[PDB]
Design a protein around this ligand. Structure first.
Ligand SMILES: Cc1ccc(NC(=O)c2cccc(C(F)(F)F)c2)cc1Nc1nc(-c2cccnc2)nc2c1cnn2C
Length: 272
């Protein structure tokens, strides 16, 4: 029943090709699926514990339940044979943080805001399904060849985490909203490191002292206003994901709304 939303894939349809990561007790590979389609494949290798099996098949089962344009698509699961596997779609463009950093300045404001609308729609879906992500960050978002962003989770983030989650482990959709605000800043800066060189303790002290990240360059005023309200100390005052999706949708559909830019604070004076 755990796998009720998932298709069981036969091992003969899967070809693992290269290791692209390490799972909790296994490797992640790039490979091919016949039914050929490129896929990502996470294995659970011999010797896994009971807890690891529960977490692995539980992950597969929740992923099978998710069917949304902005959530990574599960192709299927191998549970009847060993090694067990979770198989997803593969995105040639890869993870959003590296993608942005390698394409600095190459997109329009409308394209960047469109990416954020898609991420927000995915998060609205997860929150509605009562799934708390806990690690929302550009590094966990994949980009397809239509620039569509798919929320994912590759495993292990002070800089992205809401204060109540840091302080007492209160992870909710509202702490995900804080993270989403950080993702907004990541997108609009083309993948800059949140808080630059500040250490983790310096970031937490700054947040507690009331400081917040400054505006990206060339950032629409409405977009910075929105990310700032994602960073309200009081969890109950932050927008819900429904509010975020609605605002982003309305801004894109009336795109002149994005022409008004927030003032950028220069960190350097050049006089000529
Ligand atoms: C195979 C697999 C198994 C499990 C998961 N699980 C989730 O994403 C997950 C879990 C819980 C909740 C949610 C959410 F709530 F967000 F929906 C999502 C993803 C993939 N797939 C990957 N794919 C790629 C990849 C790389 C380059 C281009 N394309 C793809 N790298 C990966 C992984 C996994 N690791 N790595 C390094």
């Amino acid at each position: 029943a755990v796998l009720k939303f998932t298709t069981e894939i036969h091992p003969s349809c899967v070809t693992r090709q290269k290791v692209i990561g390490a799972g909790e007790f296994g490797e992640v590979y790039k490979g091919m699926l016949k039914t050929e389609v490129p896929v990502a494949i996470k294995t659970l290798k011999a010797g896994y514990t009971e807890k690891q099996r529960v977490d692995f098949l539980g992950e597969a089962g929740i992923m099978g339940q998710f069917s949304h344009h902005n959530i990574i698509r599960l192709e299927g699961v191998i549970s009847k044979y060993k090694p067990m596997m979770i198989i997803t779609e593969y995105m040639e463009n890869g993870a959003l943080d590296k993608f942005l950093r390698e394409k600095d300045g190459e997109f329009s404001v409308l394209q960047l805001v469109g990416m954020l609308r898609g991420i927000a729609a995915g998060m609205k879906y997860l929150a509605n399904m009562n799934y708390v992500h806990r690690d929302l960050a550009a590094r966990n978002i994949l980009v397809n060849s239509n620039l569509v962003c798919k929320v994912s989770d590759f495993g292990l983030p002070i800089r992205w985490t809401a204060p109540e989650a840091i302080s007492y482990r209160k992870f909710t959709s509202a702490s995900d909203v804080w993270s989403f605000g950080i993702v907004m800043w990541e997108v609009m800066t083309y993948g800059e490191r949140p808080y630059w060189e500040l250490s983790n303790h310096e970031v937490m002290k700054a947040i507690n002292d009331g400081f917040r990240l400054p505006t990206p360059m060339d950032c629409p005023s409405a977009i910075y206003q929105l990310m700032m309200q994602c960073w309200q100390q009081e969890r109950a005052r932050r927008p819900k994901f429904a509010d975020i999706v609605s605002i982003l949708d309305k801004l894109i559909r009336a795109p002149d709304s994005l022409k008004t830019l927030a003032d950028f604070d220069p960190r350097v004076s050049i006089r000529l």
